[PDB]
């Protein structure tokens, strides 16, 4: 894969907007939406909230896990534990990029949410290169990754698997 398709899979998460136009139910091949009552919340998939925000037709809302207090506890829980701890949403990096870039003025304290998210990320990446070094160092044959999201996997996967194949080969070249 590549980041630009993880970003595609991440635009299926649901968010809540507040439209300012009138429209009746829409029957999408992936569900139903609406109705859109001006000045009333409604829950849509991201790829539509962003596209409506760019055309000046809505007003986003911060997801509940995107609070500057619960995050300041996740950031500590992550540094205490010594394994991959569970995360608010399986796609938090892409949410807190797309949202904070496109709707940073409808989110209070954007430039602290952003730094806490980055602090969590910079740790969950450090635990990986330790869990991906003991693997080689001790020549394991299995490794249980607990709560890795698809993005951390995809940033260093096409190197790790490709450097473990060359190790299986070198380790089983004497049998015949």
């Amino acid at each position: 894969m590549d980041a630009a398709e993880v970003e595609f899979l991440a635009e299926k998460e649901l968010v809540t907007i507040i439209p300012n136009f009138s429209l009746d139910k829409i029957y999408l091949i992936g569900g139903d939406l609406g109705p859109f009552n001006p000045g009333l919340p409604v829950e849509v998939p991201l790829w539509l909230a962003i596209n409506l925000k760019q055309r000046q037709k809505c007003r986003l809302l911060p997801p509940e896990w995107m609070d500057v207090e619960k995050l300041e506890k996740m950031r500590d829980h992550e540094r205490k534990e010594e394994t991959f701890t569970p995360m608010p949403s399986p796609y938090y990096m892409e949410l807190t990029k797309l949202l904070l870039n496109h709707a940073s003025d409808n989110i209070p304290k954007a430039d602290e949410i952003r730094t806490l998210v980055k602090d969590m990320w910079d740790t969950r990446i450090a635990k990986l290169r330790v869990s991906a070094d003991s693997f080689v160092r001790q020549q394991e044959a299995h490794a249980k990754l607990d709560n890795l999201t698809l993005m951390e996997i995809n940033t260093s996967g096409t190197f790790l698997t490709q450097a473990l194949n060359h190790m299986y080969k070198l380790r089983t070249n004497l049998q015949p």
């Binding site: 991906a132 096409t158 080969k169």
Partner: protein, 194 residues
């Protein structure tokens, strides 16, 4: 992006037929001692004695070999001898595997089809060299950004450059997504002509 060259099987039981890496790999020379005379062809090295030390490509010495050593016997180069097998155990992060190459793991895995005595000690050198040089390719390839990497890559071989070019292609692709840059549609192979 769509030109998928045939990869190298030089680490498994036998090299692939169409892979241009193995073709240039096996071409490298190797020392042999002949067991019979070589009639009608002593022109190169008409007949050649028995018990003569010659240098032949690897591909040639594939079929000219048998269990009984009918035609010739083989002895490993010094890079795989007992001498260097301790050097590569002192600290493997220091060796210039491009001069001692440029096919170290590729060659060394084909010298196991000659049923020499010390195979149980070559297949332990390779494994313990590749494991030794790992934390210096996992970290100098995912953490070298917009740098002149032509000096972090000057002491590697074809099995390792292929990984140093996969670390970079995943670093320079996340750093291009973070900066809202992997949204623009671009020309794929025409900018190669330009």
């Amino acid at each position: 992006e769509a030109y998928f060259r045939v990869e190298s099987g030089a680490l498994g039981p036998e090299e692939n037929f169409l892979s241009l890496d193995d073709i240039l790999m096996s071409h490298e020379k190797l020392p042999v001692r002949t067991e019979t005379a070589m009639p009608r062809l002593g022109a190169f090295f008409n007949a050649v004695p028995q018990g003569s030390k010659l240098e032949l490509p690897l591909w040639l010495a594939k079929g000219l070999f048998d269990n009984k050593r009918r035609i010739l016997s083989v002895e490993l180069p010094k890079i795989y001898q007992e001498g260097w097998r301790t050097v590569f155990s002192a600290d493997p992060n220091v060796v210039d595997l491009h001069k001692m190459g440029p096919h170290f793991y590729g060659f060394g895995s084909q010298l196991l089809h000659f049923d020499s005595p010390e195979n149980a000690d070559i297949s332990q050198s390779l494994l313990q060299t590749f494991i030794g040089r790992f934390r210096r390719i996992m970290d100098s390839s995912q953490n070298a950004y917009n740098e002149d990497t032509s000096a972090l890559v000057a002491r590697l071989d074809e099995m390792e450059r292929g990984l140093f070019q996969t670390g970079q292609k995943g670093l320079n692709d996340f750093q291009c997504w973070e900066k809202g840059q992997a949204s623009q549609i671009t020309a794929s192979n025409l900018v190669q002509n330009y």
